[PDB]
């Protein structure tokens, strides 16, 4: 199961100054980049075009090129329409894309956030507000739903284009997606808390536990998954122990890349 995400972030400082930046993820791997400075969408992988031909891609990019300009003016015009109820600075975020399932099954989404709060989505054939959204958005929503051409485009984009494009991506980038990178471990201590560092592994699923012989330590607290630049992962597991009890403790690491031979590291 892979989630394809188009993450757009837009900042409106005042009536004139505006910028829109987009990044695109397939799972936890970046496939596209679109800086405000760039007129075109950038491939961050050799297989970012998927199974789309050059003609198909140019037509698709062109639509986004029109969208970015149109979106910017639309927000600006909607701020004028709500004033003085809503005012700059304004932050808008879009989370668009589709999740792929076994068979021909997929599920598309388009979520919109306003000042960091999820308020609007595209659902079915129209825009709608989600539970918790402020009522004033009903005017923007009525205005966006008047635009029949945008509705038909978005419908086709979510229902047809996304799953088609992502099915192509999953074929073209099979190597990268299914890559196996070996974790590397090292130990350290702070004033006492013992730390087991695990870094350089792909994919994300990993098992890290402090061991006293063959008994798993209950106090083992795993930290968050932190990213490396080369698209590998980092994670540390800590254990609080009384000084002197250091001897007999080890760190066992299980990962799909090691293939049975778990990394064992004695203190």
């Amino acid at each position, epitope marked *: 199961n892979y989630t394809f995400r188009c993450l757009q972030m837009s900042s409106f400082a005042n009536r004139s100054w505006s910028r829109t930046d987009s990044v695109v993820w397939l799972g936890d791997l970046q496939t596209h980049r679109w800086s405000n400075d760039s007129a075109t969408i950038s491939f961050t992988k050799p297989w970012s075009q998927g199974k789309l031909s050059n003609q198909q891609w140019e037509k698709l990019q062109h639509m986004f090129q*029109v969208y970015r*300009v*149109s979106f910017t*003016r*639309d927000i600006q*015009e*909607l701020v*004028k*329409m709500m*004033s003085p109820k809503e005012d700059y600075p304004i932050e808008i975020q879009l989370s668009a894309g589709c999740e792929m399932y076994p068979g021909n099954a997929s599920e598309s989404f388009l979520h919109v956030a306003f000042q960091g709060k999820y308020v609007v989505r595209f659902w079915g054939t129209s825009w709608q507000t989600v539970p918790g959204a402020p009522s004033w958005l009903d005017l923007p929503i*009525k*205005v*966006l739903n*008047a*635009d*029949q*051409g*945008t509705s038909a485009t978005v419908q086709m984009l979510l229902n047809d284009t996304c799953p088609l494009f992502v099915r192509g991506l999953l074929e073209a980038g099979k190597s990268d997606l299914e890559k196996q990178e070996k974790p590397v471990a090292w130990l350290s201590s702070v004033p006492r808390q013992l730390v087991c560092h695990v870094s350089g592994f792909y994919p994300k699923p990993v098992w890290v536990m402090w061991m006293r012989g063959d008994q798993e330590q209950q106090g083992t607290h795993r930290g968050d998954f932190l990213p490396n630049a080369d698209e590998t992962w980092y994670l540390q597991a800590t254990l609080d122990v009384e000084a002197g009890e250091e001897a007999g403790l080890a760190c066992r690491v299980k990962h799909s890349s090691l293939g049975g031979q778990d990394i064992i590291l004695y203190w």
Partner: T-cell receptor
Amino acid sequence: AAVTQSPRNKVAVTGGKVTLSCNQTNNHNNMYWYRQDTGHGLRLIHYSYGAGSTEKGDIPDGYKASRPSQENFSLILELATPSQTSVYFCASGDEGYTQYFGPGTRLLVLE
Amino acid sequence: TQVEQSPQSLVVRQGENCVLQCNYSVTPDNHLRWFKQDTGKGLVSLTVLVDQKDKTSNGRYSATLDKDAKHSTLHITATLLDDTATYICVVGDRGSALGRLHFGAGTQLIVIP
């Protein structure tokens, strides 16, 4: 959906105050002011999304707009100039794309 | 000047047909509208074209729109004296009130009775 303009025709002097009024009963939120000059298409001066709201258009200089109510959008020329001699059209519309136009207002500003 | 009309002006004899061209560079192009304007009078809507490759009709008035070529024509069949008017091409960049209308300078038609 009908729109009216008053006056329909005006002769004015430089430095004079000219007010062009536009009334719609369609309960439309949005109203627009255009001017038409031979050899150009209609150009947007000011617009409004609701009462109390006025927005600069493409050629707003020399003009001030007023929206006291949903029914009335008003184009005010504080210091009239000969360059403001034109035919002035007003329009209204709801959330849709269609703008419904008034019959026009002919203005002449003499020295 | 994102909307260009051709011819600038034209003279036809009653009963004859004429074609009026409208070419534009407006982006994006939601709809195209043809106005009729009598000297002195206001803007009477003739037809609005909305589709990628669209065709419309209104009695003696017919029209086409090609969004790829960014081009539209207005055909008048069997011109009458009352056709003497300026014909204006307008392009809306949205399917909603968020849009701006982009006006051509018009095409002047004179029908000789």
